[PDB]
C-alpha cells in the first residue's frame, strides 16, 4: 500500500507557494512522519512540498482543488 517513510520530507514547511498549473493534489502527513499534520501539494516537479494549513496559498490551493475532481480514493 502507500508509503513515504524513506528519505522524503521537507525540513518543515515551504515558503512562497506552488503554481496551480503543476499542482496535482494534496495529502496530510499524520502518524508521526514529517512535522505537524500539514498538507502536501504534489506536482510534476520532482519532489513533495510541505505546507501547514495557515498560509494563504495553502488553504487557497486545496480550496481550488475542491472545485474540480482530483479523482481521489473511494
Amino acid at each position: 500500500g502507500p508509503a513515504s517513510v524513506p528519505t522524503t520530507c521537507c525540513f518543515n514547511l515551504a515558503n512562497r507557494k506552488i503554481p496551480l498549473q503543476r499542482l496535482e493534489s494534496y495529502r496530510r502527513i499524520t502518524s508521526g512522519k514529517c512535522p505537524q499534520k500539514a498538507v502536501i501539494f504534489k506536482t510534476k516537479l520532482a519532489k513533495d512540498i510541505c505546507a501547514d494549513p495557515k498560509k494563504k496559498w495553502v488553504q487557497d490551493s486545496m480550496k481550488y482543488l475542491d472545485q474540480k475532481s482530483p479523482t481521489p480514493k473511494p
Binding site: 515558503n15 512562497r16 507557494k17 506552488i18 503554481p19 520532482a46 498560509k55 496559498w57
Partner: peptide
C-alpha cells in the same frame, strides 16, 4: 525569518 509567503515560486521555470 525571511518571508514564508510570496507570489510566484518558479520564476525561473526552466528550473524543472
Amino acid at each position: 525569518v525571511e518571508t514564508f509567503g510570496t507570489t510566484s515560486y518558479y520564476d525561473d521555470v526552466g528550473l524543472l
